[PDB]
Amino acid sequence: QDAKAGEAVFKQCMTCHRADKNMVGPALAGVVGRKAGTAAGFTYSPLNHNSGEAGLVWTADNIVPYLADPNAFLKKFLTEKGKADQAVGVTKMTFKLANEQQRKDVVAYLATLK
Ligand code: HEC
Ligand SMILES: [N]
């Protein structure tokens, strides 16, 4: 949860994201504490959209495990809500980051965006 260390991780994320504009992925400023799938202007996959509609909020404790495996996290979230029938298919332009500390740190950095 070292935000400054997270800034360096965020350079990897900038392959697809920016803070303040949509790119391959949605803009991330304000993502922490926000309903999943609700960045203005961005067309989400069914899986990413349905997860937010089912009540997924991007708290730090949700973002960190998500970053290791977006598809598996979102499917598990929906399945535990009794909504496996909304979990069919996969996300867009999928990226995984294995390193846990890097995930924790970048998530602290995301909170600094707003
Ligand atoms: C392109 C290969 C990506 C890289 C590198 C990273 N992300 Fe990403 N992310 C990408 C897309 C195309 C999407 C939307 C997928 C969909 O199916 O609609 C996302 C989504 C996120 C989210 C969820 C945002 C929301 O619900 O509003 C988060 C929190 C996120 N991405 C974070 C993130 C970080 C921190 C990354 C670096 C470790 C990162 N992503 C890389 C595409 C890509
Ligand atoms: N992502």
Which atom of ligand 1 is found nearest the CA of 107?
35
Q: CA-to-CA distance for 103 and 57, rounded, in angstroms?
A: 17
**CATH number of the domain that residue 88 is part of:** 1.10.760.10
Q: Which domain holds residue 98?
A: 2-114
**Tokens (6 digits) for 97:** 């980051």
Q: What is the whole-number distance in angstroms between the Cα of residue 15 and the centre of ligand 1?
A: 10
Q: DSSP of the chain, one letter per residue?
A: --HHHHHHHHHHHTTT--SSS-SSS---TT-TTSBTT--TT----HHHHHHHHTT-B--HHHHHHHHH-HHHHHHHHHHHTT-GGG--S--SS------HHHHHHHHHHHHTT-
Gap from CA of 82 to ligand 1 centroid (Å): 25
- Number of structural domains found in the chain: 1
